[PDB]
Design a protein around this ligand. Structure first.
Ligand SMILES: OC[C@H]1O[C@@H]2O[C@H]3[C@H](O)[C@@H](O)[C@@H](O[C@H]4[C@H](O)[C@@H](O)[C@@H](O[C@H]5[C@H](O)[C@@H](O)[C@@H](O[C@H]6[C@H](O)[C@@H](O)[C@@H](O[C@H]7[C@H](O)[C@@H](O)[C@@H](O[C@H]8[C@H](O)[C@@H](O)[C@@H](O[C@H]1[C@H](O)[C@H]2O)O[C@@H]8CO)O[C@@H]7CO)O[C@@H]6CO)O[C@@H]5CO)O[C@@H]4CO)O[C@@H]3CO
Ligand SMILES: OC[C@H]1O[C@@H]2O[C@H]3[C@H](O)[C@@H](O)[C@@H](O[C@H]4[C@H](O)[C@@H](O)[C@@H](O[C@H]5[C@H](O)[C@@H](O)[C@@H](O[C@H]6[C@H](O)[C@@H](O)[C@@H](O[C@H]7[C@H](O)[C@@H](O)[C@@H](O[C@H]8[C@H](O)[C@@H](O)[C@@H](O[C@H]1[C@H](O)[C@H]2O)O[C@@H]8CO)O[C@@H]7CO)O[C@@H]6CO)O[C@@H]5CO)O[C@@H]4CO)O[C@@H]3CO
Ligand code: HEM
Ligand code: HEM
Ligand SMILES: CC(=O)N1CCN(c2ccc(OC[C@H]3CO[C@](Cn4ccnc4)(c4ccc(Cl)cc4Cl)O3)cc2)CC1
Ligand SMILES: CC(=O)N1CCN(c2ccc(OC[C@H]3CO[C@](Cn4ccnc4)(c4ccc(Cl)cc4Cl)O3)cc2)CC1
Lengths: 444, 445
């Protein structure tokens, strides 16, 4: 019985809050060098054990929620946003069943509807950008993906309900994913806290309309919303309008920022490497045809450089930078015993550029997978959508959304850095955004 | 006409204060990577331009004080501590004459007196350490250096006055060297300013009577104090007691924490590398004889290995991390022009560790000066004592003090890391101290 190596700190309560908050990746890498794959440190009165590399990460991924708990650590910020009865407000096994319902709605038949739907929105959004200029790509992508995600994961009913003042209510909901919502108790009246809670009530209320609007129309519509309204537990109990609305919010959030971010980054990687940008466009012609017809799901499967470009963007910029659990029981990894109380953590980001197992780690090189790599060489070195019980379900949909958008975007425009500026990473938010994400764009 | 590359910060007033504050060398080397030898950034509403590498630092080192001025940047810290009419409170030509006088005291005749003074102080101090144990070297060293530096630089009369009270007065003065004193206006009253001011008066008062008393006795004492009492500007004008008192405070502050931090680090470099440590002890025997007799200045010149260990310590841990100037007129380096108003900096630490010119840069290797190295291969790669008009005058004394101390310390003890711990650097203060500088020791064979 032995404790993970502990990283002592000068500052009594803050701990490593300032060094880690400043640049978590450098911090975690420096710690990996000095202390190894399993270590502890204190931030803001809380102790964190991190698991780095595949072997160590294995513990968090392979474990039961009974032993490494996700609600204990997420409820604080998620439950106020998504709502009661949904996600981390219920016991895990109840959650899994809701996960299976959402899974059902994410299949090839729906994805075939999604492709053309997203393609139209993309084309129609970018009518405002004209033939050339300099605009913020991430904000454009943020707005577009709020349109595409809603169109696909919510109904046409809800998509037709989106205006300026609804995006504001979504923005209010984003402000729930904060530094402060995690650390500070909910009973404090902060600006962001009231802002968020106001929007939750409103948007639940807006979803109540559209659920009622569809529950009553007879036209057989087969999208994701229908899948939810039709589903049932092992019980045989259908979902309450509340439950449904709860998981509609969870879909909107999961599906929006994780794809805007990633799309935005890939933009800058492709603008920095103009040869690779050219090859992606060439592959568009080679696969789909020189006449560039509207996109099909079946064509997507064959855009393999684009696919690896997305694989590689997610490698160097996974939007979920950290996974967390609470140790409810003692757990053993690498010979260390993590005591109950620690928040146990894995970082895809660190794992995915770890010097031990990636060649030219900081290089944007989608051909790395066409060689030997730990993404197939190792279990948990490449892990942007997690693994085990808490593993993602949006991977196919996120690949469809991003793929369609960038196909359309490369068809519209050639992209370039402004004065060679490659954006750095903003760590002031759990939304990890590119700093000043403005690209130059020529018509193709 | 082009200004240096500038590093932007989101944070409005503070700018890079946190990123620089936390790890300056890390910050500066990453900046070197992205931007090159010359760049500018801002902290707490001040803009800094750094000159990294021999070629760039040549600007600061070669420049005249009118162009790149030190009073403008040092005075707020310095004058309150040393007092008026001294150092950076007077125009630079006046300071040079002052430096010339101090220099004339730092000669071989006095250094020979110093050796046997310092050795005795060292032997006597470390009697409280006993056969073995675990103690805080850095604390022991600063305590010791206060005694040795006073004895050598102030004289026997002042050293006999050194008690618990006076040690506290000096520590209050040290408190004047805060980042706070550099940033915040002097009419504010933090606890530490009051202390600095009160202690400045009480120390001057002590030095006054000490100066008075020797100006009177007939004992022909040939030391650094007498050199000051007998000195004269080109004028013909001798120093007033307040000037003598000033530079005496200057001397103790100067010759104290520079030697104590450097000695402490060397302790840790020697404890980390045990076969190096033993070779140093063998050198003692090989040079001074097997009997290990009392140290002499002459013997110190032939301790080449210990010399290079100090040289190498100063290379990796120079006590003065940043030298600074105010730009009064515009200056040009590497094609860039620094506007008047920027604070222009060099860091010996960064220069002395630069991938480009240092083979295995982070390695403590005293024998690197027996190969081809940039200390002789370049101009300003190795500059722990500065260069140009503001060049240090204390190097020879520093070496005498540290060699004598560590020579003795090696004869007395063998040193070890506690649990393989090597202290990291404390940056929260201007005395760049080692973290938890406790060392293991046992009586040497
Ligand atoms: O000696 C090296 C160390 O010195 C300085 O640390 C001081 C620090 O600045 C102050 O904060 C204070 O420490 C108090 C601390 O704040 C409290 O948390 C508490 O500490 C207790 C721990 O909570 C508890 O876990 C246990 O500690 C044991 C560890 O659990 C166990 O793993 C092991 O620790 C070893 C580490 O695992 C290993 O990594 C290595 O530690 C290195 C550190 O990681 C590194 O940061 C540095 O530490 C410096 C530090 O920077 C200084 O500021 O080097 C270390 C090399 O040793 O080795 C560890 C063993 O040394 O064992 C420990 C038990 O030894 O108990 C502790 C109480 O002991 O109370 C503290 C009250 O002092 O003071 C410290 C000491 O000067
Ligand atoms: O633009 C004119 C500028 O040109 C020269 O600077 C170049 C520099 O020498 C190159 O090294 C390189 O600099 C890179 C830079 O170091 C990186 O940090 C990065 O910068 C991006 C930021 O990371 C990102 O945050 C954002 O910047 C925004 C700021 O965060 C925000 O505060 C605000 O900027 C305000 C400034 O804070 C404020 O001081 C003021 O700035 C003006 C300067 O004071 C003035 O000297 C001049 O700068 C010259 C510079 O001296 C040349 O050497 O004009 C400045 C701006 O007009 O005014 C701002 C208030 O609006 O807004 C910015 C958004 O711009 O984005 C930046 C830029 O991508 O990227 C750089 C790599 O390209 O390039 C620069 C520029 O060519
Ligand atoms: C690039 C896009 C995406 C990435 C990189 C991503 C990443 C992740 C990661 C890392 C996890 C594991 C979290 C943990 O273990 O703590 C996860 C879980 C999950 N994701 Fe995503 N996601 C993306 C898009 C989506 C989409 C579009 C949806 C909705 C269809 C979604 C819904 C979910 C759900 C329901 C979970 C399960 C949470 C749990 O079981 O505790 N994600 N995702
Ligand atoms: C190892 C110990 C020492 C180191 C590393 C050191 C370092 C330095 C450095 C880097 C400078 C240049 C300052 C600048 O340009 O900003 C300097 C200047 C100076 N030092 Fe030292 N020093 C040491 C010991 C001493 C001692 C013992 C004395 C007095 C006996 C002393 C007195 C001075 C003086 C008078 C200056 C000139 C300041 C000026 O002209 O602006 N130093 N020293
Ligand atoms: C203290 C500290 O150092 N830190 C505070 C906590 N910090 C953190 C916060 C949240 C987090 O996230 C995990 C939870 C919350 O969000 C998702 C991630 N997600 C998003 C899309 N797919 C998955 C999620 C799951 C299902 C659904 Cl329906 C929707 C979503 Cl948003 O899992 C991960 C890390 C890490 C940094
Ligand atoms: C904002 C910022 O980034 N920062 C704050 C200011 N920072 C700084 C502060 C002081 C400094 O110091 C140079 C001046 C001050 O002190 C000496 C150094 N000194 C000591 C011994 N030998 C030389 C000195 C010279 C002669 C005599 Cl008589 C006595 C002394 Cl104390 O020169 C150098 C740098 C640099 C870091």
């Amino acid at each position: 019985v032995k404790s993970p190596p502990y990283i002592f700190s000068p500052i009594p309560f803050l701990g490593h809050a300032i060094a880690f908050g400043k640049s978590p990746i450098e911090f975690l890498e420096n710690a990996y060098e000095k202390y190894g794959p399993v270590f502890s440190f204190t931030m803001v009165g809380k102790t964190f054990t991190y698991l780095l590399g595949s072997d160590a990460a294995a513990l968090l991924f392979n474990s039961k929620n009974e032993d490494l708990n996700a609600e204990d650590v997420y409820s604080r910020l998620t439950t106020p946003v998504f709502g009661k009865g949904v996600a981390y407000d219920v016991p895990n096994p109840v959650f899994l069943e809701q996960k299976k319902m959402l899974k059902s709605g994410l299949n090839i038949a729906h994805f075939k509807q999604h492709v053309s739907i997203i393609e139209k929105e993309t084309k129609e959004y970018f009518e405002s950008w004209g033939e050339s200029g300099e605009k913020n790509v991430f904000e454009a992508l943020s707005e577009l993906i709020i349109l595409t995600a809603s169109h696909c994961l919510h109904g046409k009913e809800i998509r037709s309900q989106l205006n300026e003042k609804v995006a504001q209510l979504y923005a209010d909901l984003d402000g729930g994913f904060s530094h402060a919502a995690w650390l500070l108790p909910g009973w404090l009246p902060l600006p962001s806290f009231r802002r968020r809670d106001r929007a939750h009530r409103e948007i639940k209320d807006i979803f109540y309309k559209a659920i009622q609007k569809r529950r009553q129309s007879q036209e057989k519509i087969d999208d994701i919303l229908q899948t939810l309204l039709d589903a049932t537990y092992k019980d045989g109990r259908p979902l309450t309008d509340d439950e449904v609305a709860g998981m509609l919010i969870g879909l909107l959030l999961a599906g929006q920022h994780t794809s805007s971010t990633t799309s935005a980054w890939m933009g800058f990687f492709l603008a920095r490497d103009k040869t690779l940008q050219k090859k992606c466009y060439l592959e568009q012609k080679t696969v789909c045809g020189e006449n560039l017809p509207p996109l099909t799901y079946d064509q997507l499967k064959d855009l393999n450089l684009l696919d690896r470009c997305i694989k590689e963007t997610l490698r160097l910029r996974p939007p979920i930078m950290i996974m967390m659990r609470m140790a409810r029981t003692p757990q053993t990894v690498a010979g260390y015993t993590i005591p109950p109380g620690h928040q146990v953590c894995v970082s895809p980001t660190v794992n995915q550029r770890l010097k031990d197992s990636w060649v030219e780690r900081l290089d944007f090189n989608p051909d790395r997978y066409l060689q030997d790599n730990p993404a197939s060489g190792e279990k948990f070195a490449y892990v942007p959508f997690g693994a085990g019980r808490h593993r993602c379900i949006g991977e196919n949909f996120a690949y469809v959304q991003i793929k369609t958008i960038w196909s359309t975007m490369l068809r519209l425009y050639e992209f370039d850095l402004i004065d060679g500026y490659f954006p750095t990473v903003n760590y002031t938010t759990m939304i990890h955004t590119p700093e000043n994400p403005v690209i130059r764009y020529k018509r193709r």
